[PDB]
Amino acid sequence: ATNHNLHITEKLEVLAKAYSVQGDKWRALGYAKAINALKSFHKPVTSYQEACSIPGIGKRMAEKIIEILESGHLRKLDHISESVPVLELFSNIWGAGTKTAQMWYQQGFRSLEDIRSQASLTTQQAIGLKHYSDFLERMPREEATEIEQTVQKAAQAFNSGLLCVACGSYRRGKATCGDVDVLITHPDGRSHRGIFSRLLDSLRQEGFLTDDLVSQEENGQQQKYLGVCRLPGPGRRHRRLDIIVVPYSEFACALLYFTGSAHFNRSMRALAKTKGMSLSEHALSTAVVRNTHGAKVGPGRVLPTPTEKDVFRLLGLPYREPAERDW
DNA sequence: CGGCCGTACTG
DNA sequence: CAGTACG
DNA sequence: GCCG
Ligand code: NA
Ligand code: NA
Ligand code: NA
Ligand code: NA
Numbered sequence: 001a002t003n004h005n006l007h008i009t010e011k012l013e014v015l016a017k018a019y020s021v022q023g024d025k026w027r028a029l030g031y032a033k034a035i036n037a038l039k040s041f042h043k044p045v046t047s048y049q050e051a052c053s054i055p056g057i058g059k060r061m062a063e064k065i066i067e068i069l070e071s072g073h074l075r076k077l078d079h080i081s082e083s084v085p086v087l088e089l090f091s092n093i094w095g096a097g098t099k100t101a102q103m104w105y106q107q108g109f110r111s112l113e114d115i116r117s118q119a120s121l122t123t124q125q126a127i128g129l130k131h132y133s134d135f136l137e138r139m140p141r142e143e144a145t146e147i148e149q150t151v152q153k154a155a156q157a158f159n160s161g162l163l164c165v166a167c168g169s170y171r172r173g174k175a176t177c178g179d180v181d182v183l184i185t186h187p188d189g190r191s192h193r194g195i196f197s198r199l200l201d202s203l204r205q206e207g208f209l210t211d212d213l214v215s216q217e218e219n220g221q222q223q224k225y226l227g228v229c230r231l232p233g234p235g236r237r238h239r240r241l242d243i244i245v246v247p248y249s250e251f252a253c254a255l256l257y258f259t260g261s262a263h264f265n266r267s268m269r270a271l272a273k274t275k276g277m278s279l280s281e282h283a284l285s286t287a288v289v290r291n292t293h294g295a296k297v298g299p300g301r302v303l304p305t306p307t308e309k310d311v312f313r314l315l316g317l318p319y320r321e322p323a324e325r326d327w
Numbered sequence: 328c329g330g331c332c333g334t335a336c337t338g
Numbered sequence: 339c340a341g342t343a344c345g
Numbered sequence: 346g347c348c349g
Contacts (some may be wrong), residue, residue: 056347069337
């Protein structure tokens with residue numbers, strides 16, 4: 001953790017976010033990787049060639065780094081559309097993405113007041129706007145613990161054998177957490193079927209859950225619950241809660257997926273692809289058949305992965321503690 | 328030229 | 339399906 | 346945007 005180029009990545013992140021909200025996701029992914037490189041790196045970049053030498057940084061990006069050091073600014077930033085700040089504001093409503101934000105902007109909306117009174121909102125967006133400020137805040141990990149304990153307690157209350165674990169940034173050892181990721185499974189391998197009903201209707205008794213964003217409860221094969229909860233007592237804020245229930249055989253891949261980070265998973269899955277293998281939150285497969293565009297055309301076969309170490313091993317990668325998975 | 332991860336809900 | 343979301 |  002030593003940002004030796006904050007002054008540059010600072011101006012780049014602004015541009016990356018602008019491209020993201022406008023919907024230019026690949027260009028944004030490009031900047032996102034170059035930005036991290038310039039951070040993870042060990043000294044202030046002082047040359048056009050030091051830069052190029054850095055993975056994730058090409059000529060085009062190096063040139064821009066130059067401008068920041070020689071000129072102190074980036075003329076590219078002085079031509080960003082005036083719509084960006086508004087698109088970013090609209091895009092921060094849970095449930096609304098680049099497409100919805102661009103539409104609202106097109107319709108003449110410029111503020112949350114406009115959205116609240118004139119915009120047509122999906123059930124999810126109404127909930128997101130309702131907790132707009134709350135969904136932008138991170139929580140002390142200590143509170144994440146209380147939330148994971150509240151979920152786990154209600155789960156083991158009707159089946160003491162249930163294994164509950166908090167993943168995400170929590171397991172990666174961060175000081176604060178954006179939301180709480182709770183993974184639930186069962187050692188026997190069957191008793192995890194159709195438990196969402198009991199867990200969710202148990203957490204609703206005690207009034208712990210306040211809003212539901214994603215919860216397909218009419219289906220017995222529900223895999224995830226994305227919602228909102230709030231601990232009891234004064235001074236509590238609404239927090240995002242994400243729960244997944246998986247079969248014990250998929251426990252390791254699930255744990256690995258849910259622990260992240262997101263960029264870490266993508267990188268790992270990208271490696272598996274170069275090796276004709278495939279990785280998901282369900283399993284690690286080998287002998288996968290893909291076409292010219294890297295799209296799966298053949299299923300291949302699932303490899304036994306009892307633990308996270310097995311996944312790294314099978315991929316010919318040295319294991320990495322959760323805390324060492326921020327990218 | 329063209330992929331850039333592989334999934335799960337919603338309506 | 340497109341959109342949005344999860345890590 | 347980067348990279349193979
Ligand atoms: Na350009
Ligand atoms: Na959003
Ligand atoms: Na999280
Ligand atoms: Na539902």
